[PDB]
Scaffold this active site. Structure first.
Site, PDB file in Angstrom:
ATOM      1  CE  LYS A  38      -2.106   1.358   3.791  1.00  0.00           C
ATOM      2  NZ  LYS A  38      -1.777   2.796   3.922  1.00  0.00           N
ATOM      3  CG  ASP A  66      -4.362   4.712   2.093  1.00  0.00           C
ATOM      4  OD1 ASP A  66      -5.485   5.227   1.934  1.00  0.00           O
ATOM      5  OD2 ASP A  66      -3.896   4.431   3.216  1.00  0.00           O
ATOM      6  CG  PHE A  67      -4.243   7.906  -4.083  1.00  0.00           C
ATOM      7  CD1 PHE A  67      -4.174   8.010  -5.466  1.00  0.00           C
ATOM      8  CD2 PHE A  67      -3.080   7.625  -3.384  1.00  0.00           C
ATOM      9  CE1 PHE A  67      -2.987   7.820  -6.146  1.00  0.00           C
ATOM     10  CE2 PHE A  67      -1.869   7.428  -4.063  1.00  0.00           C
ATOM     11  CZ  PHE A  67      -1.833   7.531  -5.451  1.00  0.00           C
ATOM     12  CE  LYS A  68      -6.960   7.017   4.833  1.00  0.00           C
ATOM     13  NZ  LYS A  68      -5.612   6.629   4.344  1.00  0.00           N
ATOM     14  CD  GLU A  74     -16.555  16.346 -14.767  1.00  0.00           C
ATOM     15  OE1 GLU A  74     -17.657  16.856 -14.475  1.00  0.00           O
ATOM     16  OE2 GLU A  74     -15.848  16.743 -15.718  1.00  0.00           O
TER      17      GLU A  74
END
Lengths: 207, 208
Positions: A38, A66-68, A74
């Site tokens: 991750k 893990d970019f939340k 869009e």
């Protein structure tokens, strides 16, 4: 479960180091014990998204971004597309922005043959303010949308059993325990250990 | 207000194009009408964080990084630090993850002489599920922490009045109206127009 990802040794490395040399070096030291890594924004923003392809090629590992993801639909679409184009196998997305924001990510993941993990809850102190109270409803939202991969906290075991009840016995659950989660996420205990291999191999011993 | 940022013509360009050539080109077309540009992850992830410094140098503009920061405190610190090191003047942060997550960002901004914008609410349909109900408490959390810059939605004017009441008359408020917000954010109406300059110039004429 056949229809969800196989994570080697049920151990995901949280590679949260921010410099490319260290991240590649420390990951190398523990490469034999893990096939799923991750990575988050501090590393990719510092070193470039090209680092994702680098990990997959050098170590042969799966990458979870893990970019939340927490924007409007869009924009979520575009973030997911860029992240998958860069080679990520999966992306972690927030549920608090609601169902359409999650569906946007699911759409791109289905198109490109990748996976969305829904983040149902967090365990830092501030999570009590809004996140904890929304957790069950977010998990149910995921189930209703056909989400098959979830991230939940491990700090409270009874929270994991509750999450399990909501998502069912077959969906994939990872947590930062293995009675409920399919894989555990470990970061510092490994990447900071004077002997990352001794830390990793040891953890797998208990597992 | 002297202690918050001056945005030229009260108009912020939401530069949401994802390729560097178009982003720089279209931005160039409307450069005389704006000094503040908002950039998001699609552009930066596609082209690299180096694009931030490129904007500031080529156009002399302020950059707001619309990164919707929404992680644990330690990770938020690192995201902010990396973003500020890349040259961003400000960063937009979610309030939903709570006060310590916001404070982590405030700490780095104070250290580095930059700004945090607290995102109090969003206006896409899904925002009704959880965000709408938390909005007032998130704005109050911001005030209690000394946040001076806020992002709020404009689709509901009466929501801006409510937000303005919570944050007070002096804090800086931007929104996608100008009776309540200090600047408006415009994207597609400008960057997606046969003549973006015509669009931008026109918008500014309405603002007086």
């Amino acid at each position: 479960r056949v229809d969800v990802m196989d994570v080697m040794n049920r151990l995901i490395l949280a590679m949260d180091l921010m410099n490319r040399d260290d991240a590649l070096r420390v990951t190398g030291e523990v490469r034999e014990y893990i096939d799923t890594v991750k990575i988050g924004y501090p590393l990719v923003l510092s070193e470039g998204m090209d680092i994702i392809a680098e990990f997959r090629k050098r170590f042969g590992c799966r990458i979870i971004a893990d970019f939340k993801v927490a924007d409007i639909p869009e924009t979520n679409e575009k973030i997911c597309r860029a992240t998958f184009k860069a080679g990520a196998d999966a992306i972690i997305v927030h549920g608090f922005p609601g169902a359409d924001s999650v569906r946007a990510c699911l759409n791109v993941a289905e198109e490109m043959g990748r996976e969305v993990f829904l983040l149902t809850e967090m365990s830092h102190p501030g999570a009590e303010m809004f996140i904890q109270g929304a957790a069950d409803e977010i998990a149910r939202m995921g189930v209703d949308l056909g989400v098959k991969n979830y991230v939940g906290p491990s700090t409270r075991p009874e929270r994991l059993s509750r999450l399990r009840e909501i998502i069912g016995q077959d969906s994939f659950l990872i947590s930062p325990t293995l009675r409920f989660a399919d894989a555990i996420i470990v970061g510092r205990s490994i990447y900071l250990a004077d002997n990352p291999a001794a830390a990793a191999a040891g953890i797998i011993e208990s597992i």
